[PDB]
């Protein structure tokens, strides 16, 4: 099943190594634990807001 694999300096542009990271997201019935950021504005006092 396994075959040799590697890279060398002489490899062409399409033959060079590339680091690939996949950030997968899925929603389940369980309560959510991860959530994106969420903003806060500046503070003002002594005036209706």
């Amino acid at each position, epitope marked *: 099943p396994l075959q040799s694999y590697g890279f060398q300096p002489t490899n062409g542009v399409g033959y060079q190594p590339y680091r690939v990271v996949v950030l*997968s997201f*899925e*929603l*389940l*019935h*369980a309560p*959510a634990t991860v959530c994106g950021p969420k903003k806060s504005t500046n503070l003002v006092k002594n005036k209706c807001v």
Partner: nanobody
Amino acid sequence: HVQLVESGGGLVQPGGSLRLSCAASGRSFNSYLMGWFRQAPGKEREFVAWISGSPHDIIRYRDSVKDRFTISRDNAKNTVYLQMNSLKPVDTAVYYCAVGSLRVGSFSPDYWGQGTQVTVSS
């Protein structure tokens, strides 16, 4: 508890459109996927379509029905909609509404309804 109730069943001509809707109650299903399955009598229930309740709604369909039985949903009402379009006699079946979660990127039904008979005949 969670219950699924169907509505809109009947019989439509080949080429005549229809709509089946199944409302889901009990809990919220924003992390779920709203979907439908159909079972042609005497056969094994085949997928129809599912839709996620997300800002980037993901939709899957079934090969025989892709782009014909449009599917949508509602998050506030927690209901699944199936708009059947330009049907053929081969589309006769009992359509079930499925509520499930996205496990390993595959729609995994968790809760099922009672179904409804949608028939197509000449």
